[PDB]
């Protein structure tokens, strides 16, 4: 699951 952008969490 990523951020709005995608900060591969």
Q: How many CB atoms lie within 10 A of CB 4?
A: 5
Q: Are 7 and 1 in contact (CB under 8 A)?
A: no
Measured between alpha carbons, how far is 3 from 9 in angstroms, rounded to an integer?
8
Residues 6+ apart with CB under 8 A from 3: 9
Measured between alpha carbons, how far is 9 from 7 in angstroms, rounded to an integer?
6
Per-residue tokens: 3 = 């951020």
State CA 2 to chain mean position distance: 2
DSSP string over 1-9? ---SS----
Per-residue tokens: 8 = 């591969």
Q: Are 8 and 1 in contact (CB under 8 A)?
A: no
């Amino acid at each position: 699951t990523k951020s709005a952008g995608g900060i591969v969490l």
